[PDB]
Amino acid sequence: TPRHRGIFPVVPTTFADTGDLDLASQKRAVDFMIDAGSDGLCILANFSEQFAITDDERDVLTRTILEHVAGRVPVIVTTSHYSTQVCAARSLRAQQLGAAMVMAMPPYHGATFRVPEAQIFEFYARVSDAIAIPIMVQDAPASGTALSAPFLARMAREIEQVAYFKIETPGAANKLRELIRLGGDAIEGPWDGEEAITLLADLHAGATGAMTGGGFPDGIRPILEAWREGRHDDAYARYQAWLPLINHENRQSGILTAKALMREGGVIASERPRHPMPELHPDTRAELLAIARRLDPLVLRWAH
Amino acid sequence: TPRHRGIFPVVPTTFADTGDLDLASQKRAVDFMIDAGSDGLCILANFSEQFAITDDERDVLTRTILEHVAGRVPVIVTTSHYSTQVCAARSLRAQQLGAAMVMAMPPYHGATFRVPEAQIFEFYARVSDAIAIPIMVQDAPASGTALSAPFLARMAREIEQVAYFKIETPGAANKLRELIRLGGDAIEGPWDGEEAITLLADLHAGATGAMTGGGFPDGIRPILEAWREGRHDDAYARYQAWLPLINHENRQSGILTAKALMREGGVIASERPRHPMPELHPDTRAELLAIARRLDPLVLRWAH
Numbered sequence: 001t002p003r004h005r006g007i008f009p010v011v012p013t014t015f016a017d018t019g020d021l022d023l024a025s026q027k028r029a030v031d032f033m034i035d036a037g038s039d040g041l042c043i044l045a046n047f048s049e050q051f052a053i054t055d056d057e058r059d060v061l062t063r064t065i066l067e068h069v070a071g072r073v074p075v076i077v078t079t080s081h082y083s084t085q086v087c088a089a090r091s092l093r094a095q096q097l098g099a100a101m102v103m104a105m106p107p108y109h110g111a112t113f114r115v116p117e118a119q120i121f122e123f124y125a126r127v128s129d130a131i132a133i134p135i136m137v138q139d140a141p142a143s144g145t146a147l148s149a150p151f152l153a154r155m156a157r158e159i160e161q162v163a164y165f166k167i168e169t170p171g172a173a174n175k176l177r178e179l180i181r182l183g184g185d186a187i188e189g190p191w192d193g194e195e196a197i198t199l200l201a202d203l204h205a206g207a208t209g210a211m212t213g214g215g216f217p218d219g220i221r222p223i224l225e226a227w228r229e230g231r232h233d234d235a236y237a238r239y240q241a242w243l244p245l246i247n248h249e250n251r252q253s254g255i256l257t258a259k260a261l262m263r264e265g266g267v268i269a270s271e272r273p274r275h276p277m278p279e280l281h282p283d284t285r286a287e288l289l290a291i292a293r294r295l296d297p298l299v300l301r302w303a304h
Numbered sequence: 305t306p307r308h309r310g311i312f313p314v315v316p317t318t319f320a321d322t323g324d325l326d327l328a329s330q331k332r333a334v335d336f337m338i339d340a341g342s343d344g345l346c347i348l349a350n351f352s353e354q355f356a357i358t359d360d361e362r363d364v365l366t367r368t369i370l371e372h373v374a375g376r377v378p379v380i381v382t383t384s385h386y387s388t389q390v391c392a393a394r395s396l397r398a399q400q401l402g403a404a405m406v407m408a409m410p411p412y413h414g415a416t417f418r419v420p421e422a423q424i425f426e427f428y429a430r431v432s433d434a435i436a437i438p439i440m441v442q443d444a445p446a447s448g449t450a451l452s453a454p455f456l457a458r459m460a461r462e463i464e465q466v467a468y469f470k471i472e473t474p475g476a477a478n479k480l481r482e483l484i485r486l487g488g489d490a491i492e493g494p495w496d497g498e499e500a501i502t503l504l505a506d507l508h509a510g511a512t513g514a515m516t517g518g519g520f521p522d523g524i525r526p527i528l529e530a531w532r533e534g535r536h537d538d539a540y541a542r543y544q545a546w547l548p549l550i551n552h553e554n555r556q557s558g559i560l561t562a563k564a565l566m567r568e569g570g571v572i573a574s575e576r577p578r579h580p581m582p583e584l585h586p587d588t589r590a591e592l593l594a595i596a597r598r599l600d601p602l603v604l605r606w607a608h
Contacts, residue, residue: 019387019389046413046414046416046417051386051413051414051417052386052387052390053387053390054359054387054390055358055359055360056359082355082356082580082581083323083355083356083357083578083579083580084578084579084580085323085578085579086356086357086358107580108414109350109355109446110350110355110412110414110415110446110447110448111414111415111445111446111447111448112350112444112445112446113350113355113446115580115581115582116582118582119579119580119581119582120580122579122580123579123580126579140416141415141416142413142414142415142416142417143414143415144414144415274387274388274389275387275388275389275423275426275427275430276386276387276388276411276419276423276424276426276427277386277419277423278419278420278422278423
């Protein structure tokens with residue numbers, strides 16, 4: 001029924017050791033992620049360190065990644081921006097370059113500038129007016145904005161392109177259940193995130209998709225597949241095996257997790273973030289690799 | 305002693321009714337603010353709705369405003385950005401275009417992305433290494449980041465260009481007093497903000513400058529002048545007369561205050577913000593103007 005379902009990991013932005021964009025590694029990261037079995041990819045999201053790049057770099061990354069993917073899997077382009085007109089323009093450009101969907105945080109800035117529901121609704125309505133591809137509404141704490149289940153459901157029922165959701169706030173499972181009940185079939189994509197930390201509970205609640213870290217989508221996808229097949233006990237077993245990795249990414253290594261793993265496996269040239277974001281502490285990184293090695297993920301055995 | 309002191313109001317960004325940059329009105333706003341007696345100007349700050357414009361617009365605005373100011377008064381260019389290298393590059397560019405100082409929020413993103421003190425120090429140290437003009441560190445709630453007085457004083461003592469500060473967090477007076485005590489003469493510019501709501505207590509604490517709204521710097525400067533003259537009682541009288549206006553800006557009309565005033569006075573063509581930022585409520589605006597008329601500010605009698 002839905003146009004998209006499954007696992008859509010966030011593509012990290014690859015930098016050279018000195019901070020410059022490293023497009024050669026960027027393409028390899030993309031290729032590994034597709035080889036990992038990803039149903040699709042999400043680019044320029046927070047786990048893509050989008051906050052550390054310029055508009056020019058954003059456009060370069062968008063064109064480069066979309067061209068390299070070459071239509072092999074659908075791509076979700078994050079177009080978040082406070083300005084409605086700017087978000088609309090970036091979303092149109094994404095569509096023109098082949099994007100299958102765009103993701104956008106509700107308009108906001110820092111932890112002081114918020115926008116009333118009425119204007120948020122207009123923000124999405126206007127972005128929707130400008131494009132012909134679906135919009136994924138992101139419900140995450142970074143925005144400091146409250147997007148109730150009723151409001152989200154209302155946008156889905158009244159705004160043409162609003163059809164997908166990335167629920168990353170506390171109690172996502174309960175919210176997803178509410179969103180689906182209130183939105184009905186208007187809720188085409190009730191998805192979760194946070195690197196898949198609450199994946200199993202979210203699937204129970206009706207989630208049909210997950211936006212995770214891009215270091216090991218091959219380890220997470222089977223969980224959604226088993227759930228899809230109606231094998232809940234099998235889902236739990238697979239969920240249990242990988243939970244320590246998921247947990248370490250969520251609470252210890254964070255954003256850099258995928259890049260650290262890709263660097264270890266030779267997928268990318270450098271795992272460094274752009275200053276001032278701190279490097280992974282040594283033990284934190286060592287523990288990450290030790291857990292990953294117990295799981296034999298593709299990222300550590302990608303002969304390309 | 306300091307290179308700069310007095311009032312440095314934030315220049316609002318003027319848009320056309322449809323959201324496009326209105327450079328003609330932008331120039332008139334700058335001329336009015338200078339005619340109002342501003343000691344200097346600060347551009348592209350949050351009160352300039354910088355979160356609603358693009359990198360390209362940012363550069364257009366910087367060149368347009370600096371050139372129009374034509375060296376009449378010093379200009380502080382806000383160059384905030386999470387990326388150290390990006391901020392450094394924008395700061396160097398601002399300097400080359402004629403900036404007298406740059407203002408930067410500590411690196412952060414949304415309400416979720418923070419940076420350890422250690423990296424914040426390096427962020428500022430590296431921006432300083434790249435330029436030859438002073439840096440104004442902004443201590444504001446929007447960053448959701450903690451910049452203790454001891455840490456701020458340390459940066460001033462150890463980082464060459466870190467010499468100015470805009471303390472906008474609660475209890476600014478106490479912090480300013482502590483910053484000055486710990487920083488000594490390294491604290492060249494202990495300034496406040498928040499449209500001057502706590503100006504009098506801050507001057508008592510040792511503030512030598514104020515970054516206010518750009519709507520009525522002519523009404524605020526006399527307070528700082530009276531204080532410098534050692535006439536505390538006169539400062540109080542002037543403070544008392546304008547406090548209702550300052551207070552209405554701080555809690556009722558906010559960012560759009562300056563633009564609503566300039567528009568009413570014919571200084572600019574449109575007072576509208578960029579969508580999705582909400583327009584001022586009718587009552588809030590009417591009350592704003594009614595208070596302004598009781599004070600006869602220049603913005604309502606600028607014959608140009």
